[PDB]
């Protein structure tokens, strides 16, 4: 995965739910959707649970990077929980050798 839109969020939810579990190596720094997945895994408690200030900051980044209105941002936060659930398949390529 690099950068991507909300379409790659639904693609990640598809490929995660595929069994055999195709691991989603999400490359960082490219930004936009991979930055929602990246800042999710950067501050991930357990699976799709991330905290309140980071979830409504993510609502701002879905309302700006995706321009999805706040209800649809909570919708892609529900899909954020559903995708981030398999952090063992998410592999953050945070460069910064």
């Amino acid at each position: 995965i690099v950068e991507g839109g909300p379409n790659v969020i639904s693609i990640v939810l598809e490929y995660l739910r595929d069994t055999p579990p195709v691991p989603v190596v999400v490359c960082d720094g490219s930004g936009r959707a991979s930055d929602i997945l990246a800042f999710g895994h950067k501050y991930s408690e357990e699976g799709g649970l991330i905290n309140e200030s980071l979830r409504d900051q993510l609502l701002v980044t879905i309302q700006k990077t995706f321009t999805y209105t706040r209800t649809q941002a909570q919708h892609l936060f529900i899909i954020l929980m559903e995708c981030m659930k398999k952090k063992e398949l998410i592999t953050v390529f945070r460069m910064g050798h």
Binding site: S53, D56, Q57, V60
Partner: peptide
């Protein structure tokens, strides 16, 4: 310079989220 400028950009990560959160608050 490597550890100190590692500190500056990683701490302005907090400042970049701070201005964006105040934008939601305004």
């Amino acid at each position: 310079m490597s550890m100190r400028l590692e500190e500056v950009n990683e701490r302005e990560h907090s400042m970049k989220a701070s201005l964006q959160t105040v934008d939601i608050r305004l």
